[PDB]
Amino acid sequence: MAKKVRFYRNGDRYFKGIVYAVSSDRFRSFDALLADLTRSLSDNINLPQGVRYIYTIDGSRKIGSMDELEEGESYVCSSDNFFDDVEYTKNVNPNWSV
């Protein structure tokens, strides 16, 4: 079963998040998910090196596998090891998944 999650772009206060359905049957590896997020989140300023790392919404945890993603949660995609502490979910409907 795919997990429905919401991805945001490191450092971008104006992006409202992209909803993904994530499972190993569609993404053959974690690298394939990273590649597809590089495609959809394409932004030369905030993602200069594409999507190389995924963090929880608050930056507390680095996600290393699709198994670590959880239904209904939000995550931040980054080109590097620096998580930019901005209010990603400001003014986004907390019930976007309802």
UniProtKB/Swiss-Prot annotation:
<feature type="modified residue" description="Phosphoserine; by PKC">
    <location>
        <position position="24"/>
    </location>
</feature>
<feature type="modified residue" description="Phosphoserine; by CK2, MARK1 and PKA">
    <location>
        <position position="65"/>
    </location>
</feature>
<feature type="modified residue" description="Phosphoserine; by PKC">
    <location>
        <position position="60"/>
    </location>
</feature>
<feature type="modified residue" description="Phosphotyrosine; by ABL">
    <location>
        <position position="20"/>
    </location>
</feature>
<feature type="modified residue" description="Phosphoserine; by CK2">
    <location>
        <position position="40"/>
    </location>
</feature>
<comment type="function">
    <text>Microtubule-associated protein required for initial steps of neuronal dispersion and cortex lamination during cerebral cortex development. May act by competing with the putative neuronal protein kinase DCLK1 in binding to a target protein. May in that way participate in a signaling pathway that is crucial for neuronal interaction before and during migration, possibly as part of a calcium ion-dependent signal transduction pathway. May be part with PAFAH1B1/LIS-1 of overlapping, but distinct, signaling pathways that promote neuronal migration.</text>
</comment>
<protein>
    <recommendedName>
        <fullName>Neuronal migration protein doublecortin</fullName>
    </recommendedName>
</protein>
<comment type="subunit">
    <text>Interacts with tubulin. Interacts with USP9X.</text>
</comment>
<feature type="domain" description="Doublecortin 1">
    <location>
        <begin position="3"/>
        <end position="89"/>
    </location>
</feature>
